[PDB]
Amino acid sequence: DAGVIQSPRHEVTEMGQQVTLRCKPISGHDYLFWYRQTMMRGLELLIYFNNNVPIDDSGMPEDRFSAKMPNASFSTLKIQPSEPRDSAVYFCASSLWEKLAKNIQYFGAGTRLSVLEDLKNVFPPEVAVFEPSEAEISHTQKATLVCLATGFYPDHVELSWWVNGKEVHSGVCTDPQPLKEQPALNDSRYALSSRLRVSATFWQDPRNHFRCQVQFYGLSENDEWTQDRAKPVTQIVSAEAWGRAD
Amino acid sequence: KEVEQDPGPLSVPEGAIVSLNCTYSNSAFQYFMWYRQYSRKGPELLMYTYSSGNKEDGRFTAQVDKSSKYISLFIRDSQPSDSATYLCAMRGDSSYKLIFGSGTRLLVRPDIQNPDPAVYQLRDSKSSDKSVCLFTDFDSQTNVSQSKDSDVYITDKCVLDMRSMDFKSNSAVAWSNKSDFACANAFNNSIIP
Amino acid sequence: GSHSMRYFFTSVSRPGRGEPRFIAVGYVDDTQFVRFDSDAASQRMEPRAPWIEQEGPEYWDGETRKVKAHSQTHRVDLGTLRGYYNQSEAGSHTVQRMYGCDVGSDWRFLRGYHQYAYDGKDYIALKEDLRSWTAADMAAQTTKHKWEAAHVAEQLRAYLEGTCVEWLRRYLENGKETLQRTDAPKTHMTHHAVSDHEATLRCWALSFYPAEITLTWQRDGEDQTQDTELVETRPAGDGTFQKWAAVVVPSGQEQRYTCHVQHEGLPKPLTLRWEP
Amino acid sequence: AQWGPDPAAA
Amino acid sequence: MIQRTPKIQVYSRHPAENGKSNFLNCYVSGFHPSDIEVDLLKNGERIEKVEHSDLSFSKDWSFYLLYYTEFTPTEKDEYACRVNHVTLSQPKIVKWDRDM
């Protein structure tokens, strides 16, 4: 009814650290599959359970990876220690015999896991908004706002516009990918750009509130930070702007 | 358990027909299907096909020729919503484990009734106003590319969709921190019509 | 002549002692070639014939998977049926399944089958047409209505007609030395005495493959049954089979009773009568 | 070579 | 729920000559349920290394097994097959006989 649920959605961690991935499958599904995806090997099976016992586990690497279904409603896939090469998306999926018949497996949205060399290069985004040109508004009856999120790493962000406290999807254009700030450093920071176009008769009304929200995934309160910069942790960075006519 | 697949990006116009395909090496395989994965989402099944035979489902046809060891998907009437990665899975007798190809990224560039290409300057909502450039309202034939003699950033475009006005627009954005920056010229390495 | 490939599975709940006993075996003709036992150390589908041992790793992993997953389905099925039949949970109960496919002298597909039983009586089986099911009244009707709806016969049909037969055809070649032989029987008749006035005459037939054999007795004319001890055909241990039929008869009338042995791998029917 | 991957349960 | 009492047959693999190596077999069939105890015996004492077939069944659902060990027959030594099963009230012993 809601499908496969995976916690977390993103997990930035340091190497050495036990990562633990969870999945609750669809109620009624006796088959549960852990798939990973990298760019180098593609989507791959790790393991799958059938009424809670593991069946095919040929894609489990030799040490470090462990996986269980302590009961029908939950599974962990546990990496201990992590290494940077475990960075991947890790999907979960569930199915039944009458659906595996037609090879319908049902997937979660996956836990984008980045295992890193050292947490000291993590930074949240600094976020700005830019407000449409006078030019653009007489040329077309239309005003494009632009949101930059910049200075961040790793690239675990989720940009969204909220117009007057409801999130809009119409007229939006988040960038396909982050783009690196410093193509000159091996492990460099990112920027990501988005747009929102609306009418002149909507941008000009000062009643209207425009917000750019960048949900960033980072460290959690257990991760042991020990510089005294502010700690980069899973947080919301925002920029906002109102309609004007002056 | 390995299947070759050209990763794209395959860029075709709205209206086109796209051929996607994998070839595979092991013939113990027996069921063949296509999953489609949207940017940040799980993959969902698109179409499956038992054996030699072709299943059709509206705009999607899917094929397997087993002698050649060649799997294919055919999208007619390309919609932009079909922009996605497309992954051919397949399995055998012995296990439910799907074997996936790397995947092919399909990108369908939505047509635009009235191209209107211009290059707008934009100040910040805040006192340390940086500037930033919008190159926008160009046609779905135009490539944005840039990279420069500068640490000047230009984003690969994307297509913003104003559904209710029926006004789909392309747009790409460019900025920098240093003085000798300006709009119009900043996008001029992309060699427009 | 004909040829078959059959897999037999068995599964026995054991309330107290955790998960149930599983025993798969696979035959070609009457030669046993693979087995799995849950209670054995390896947890591997094991060869039981020299001709299958050729098979690669792809094979042995993938057979071990298929069989394991099957044991789990039985594990559940035991639970489901304890349900449908309303049984106590300290009771041991048995699921059994046999499927497989036959072929003619031409090695073409000739029939296919799949039959399933709870506690050693017929539960549900797939009809000869491979489209439909036949169910033993009460509980089976619910299984069927489930199986109709997941299109289980459609999958099975594909196995039984296509894959089963291909593999069966593979086995008959790869192991032709053993599976496509005939060993003629080694007939011989014993003479012990039931008494003074009688004389235990037993007609043996030893060392034969395959197991289809026919022993028959005759009193001058055309006797055929009921002074005829037909034991079930039994295995020797060495891949071949033993059988015998025996007659016990008024002493000094040995001569008028004759044993008639008919095998594939006999040139003509061999016929024996007390000689020495 | 069995029926696979697994029977449909009852 | 049907119970069915084991048939028991006891025999050598090979025509029994004495002093001469062989296999003693016990073939149990027609039985249900699957739980059955089978021991090969030597003078009432219980033979030590008996192996056994993988369980299988006949098309009337009943079960069969072969238990077997490699003896040497002799003039004097008695061998037998003792079988125990839910249907049986005592474990029952079927003596080896070259005749049968």
CATH at residue E5: 2.60.40.10
Question: Do residues B157 and B131 make contact, with C-beta atoms less than 8 angstroms apart?
Answer: no
**D4 contact residues in C (CB cutoff 8 A):** 62, 65-66, 69, 159
Would you state the structure tokens that stand for residue A74, as one six-digit string? Answer: 């939950």
The DSSP element (H or E) to which B37 belongs, if any, is strand B31-37
Q: For residue A85, which phi and psi values (nearest 5 degrees)?
A: -70, 5
Question: Do residues A137 and A192 make contact, with C-beta atoms less than 8 angstroms apart?
Answer: no
Judge: domain B111-193, CATH 2.40.10.10.
no
Judged by phi (left if over 0) then psi (alpha if -120 to 50, else beta), residue A222 lies in alpha
- CA–CA distance, A94 with A2 (Å, rounded to integer): 12
Chains touching C, CB cut-off 8 Å, 3+ pairs: A, B, D, E
Given this chain, do its domains C1-181 and C182-270 carry the same CATH topology? Answer: no
Architecture of domain C1-181: 2-Layer Sandwich (3.30)
Is B94 part of the contact surface with chain C (CB cutoff 8 Å)? yes
**B93 contact residues in D (CB cutoff 8 A):** 1, 4-5
Class of domain C182-270: mainly beta
Chains touching A, CB cut-off 8 Å, 3+ pairs: B, C, D
In CATH, what number is assigned to the domain containing residue A12?
2.60.40.10
Residue from C152, C185, C160 nearest C261 by CA:
C185
- CA–CA distance, B182 with B131 (Å, rounded to integer): 9
Same domain, A19 and A139: no
Q: Which of A117, A135, A163 is the last residue of a domain?
A: A117
Experimental method: X-ray
Tell me which amino acid residue E10 is.
Answer: V
Would you state the structure tokens that stand for residue B187, as one six-digit string? Answer: 């996008």
Q: Give the total number of structural domains in chain A.
A: 2
- CA–CA distance, C62 with A198 (Å, rounded to integer): 58
- CA–CA distance, A156 with A178 (Å, rounded to integer): 9
Residue from A150, A154, A147 nearest A213 by CA:
A147
- CA–CA distance, B32 with A102 (Å, rounded to integer): 10
Contact A48 B96 (CB under 8 A): yes
Contacting residues for E100 by C-beta, under 8 A, at least 6 apart? C202, C231, C244, C246, E11
DSSP letter, residue A139: H
Would you state the structure tokens that stand for residue A16, as one six-digit string? Answer: 């050495």
**A55 contact residues in C (CB cutoff 8 A):** 65, 68-69, 72
- CA–CA distance, B43 with B58 (Å, rounded to integer): 20
Instruction: Tell me the domain boundaries of chain B.
Output: 1-110, 111-193
Same domain, A182 and A113: no
User: Strand C94-103 to strand C109-118: parallel, antiparallel, or no bridges (unpaired)?
Assistant: antiparallel
The whole domain housing A67 covers 1-117
Same domain, A112 and A122: no
Tell me which amino acid residue A193 is.
Answer: S
Question: Do residues A42 and A65 make contact, with C-beta atoms less than 8 angstroms apart?
Answer: no
* Residue labelled with tokens 């109102």: A242
* Residue labelled with tokens 């020990």: A226
Question: Do residues A172 and A161 make contact, with C-beta atoms less than 8 angstroms apart?
Answer: yes
- CA–CA distance, A111 with A88 (Å, rounded to integer): 8
Q: What is the largest CA-CA distance in chain E?
A: 47
Same domain, A136 and A39: no
- CA–CA distance, A217 with A220 (Å, rounded to integer): 9
Closest chain C residue to D5 measured between Cα atoms? C66
Residue from C141, A61, C116, A244 nearest D8 by CA:
C116
Q: For residue A243, which phi and psi values (nearest 5 degrees)?
A: -65, 150
Would you state the structure tokens that stand for residue B110, as one six-digit string? Answer: 């939505």
Q: Which of A60, A94, A117 is the last residue of a domain?
A: A117
DSSP string for residues in chain C: --EEEEEEEEEE--STTSSPEEEEEEEETTEEEEEEETTSSS-S-EE-STTTTT--HHHHHHHHHHHHHHHHHHHHHHHHHHHHHT--SSS--EEEEEEEEEE-TT-SEEEEEEEEEETTEEEEEE-TTSS-EEE-HHHHHHHHHHHHHHTHHHHHHIIIIIIIHHHHHHHHHHTHHHHT--B--EEEEEE--SBTTB-EEEEEEEEEBSS-EEEEEEESS---SSS---PPPEE-SSS-EEEEEEEE-STT-GGGEEEEEEEBTBSS-EEEE---
Question: Do residues A56 and A100 make contact, with C-beta atoms less than 8 angstroms apart?
Answer: no
Judge: domain B1-110, CATH 2.60.40.10.
yes
Contacting residues for E88 by C-beta, under 8 A, at least 6 apart? E5, E6
- CA–CA distance, C77 with E36 (Å, rounded to integer): 23
Q: Is the dihedral of CA C57, C59, C65, C68 positive or negative?
A: negative
The whole domain housing E12 covers 1-100
- CA–CA distance, E40 with E10 (Å, rounded to integer): 9
Taking 3-state DSSP, the helix, strand and coil percentages for chain A, each rounded to the nearest 5, stand at 10, 50, 45
Same domain, A20 and A139: no
The DSSP element (H or E) to which A137 belongs, if any, is helix A134-139
**B95 contact residues in C (CB cutoff 8 A):** 62, 65-66
Closest chain A residue to C148 measured between Cα atoms? A98
Same domain, A200 and A231: yes
* Residue labelled with tokens 């027609």: E30
**D2 contact residues in C (CB cutoff 8 A):** 7, 26, 63, 66-67, 70
Would you state the structure tokens that stand for residue B25, as one six-digit string? Answer: 């090496």
Residue from A236, C136, A105 nearest B48 by CA:
A105
E95 burial class (0-12, 13-18, 19+ CB within 10 angstroms)?
exposed
Q: Which of A70, A91, A117 is the last residue of a domain?
A: A117
Task: State the helix-helix crossing angle for C57-85 and C137-150, rounded to 10 degrees.
Answer: 130
Mutate to test the interface with D, among B94, B98, B99 (most CBs of D within 10 A): B94
Q: Give the total number of structural domains in chain E.
A: 1
Identify residues of E whose CB sits under 8 angstroms from chain C CBs.
Answer: 1-2, 4, 7, 9, 11, 13-15, 23, 25, 27, 29, 32-35, 53-57, 61-63, 66, 68, 99-100
Distance from the D9 Cα atom to the nearest Cα atom in chain A, whole angstroms: 8
Mutate to test the interface with B, among A103, A112, A196 (most CBs of B within 10 A): A103
Distance from the C242 Cα atom to the nearest Cα atom in chain D, whole angstroms: 29
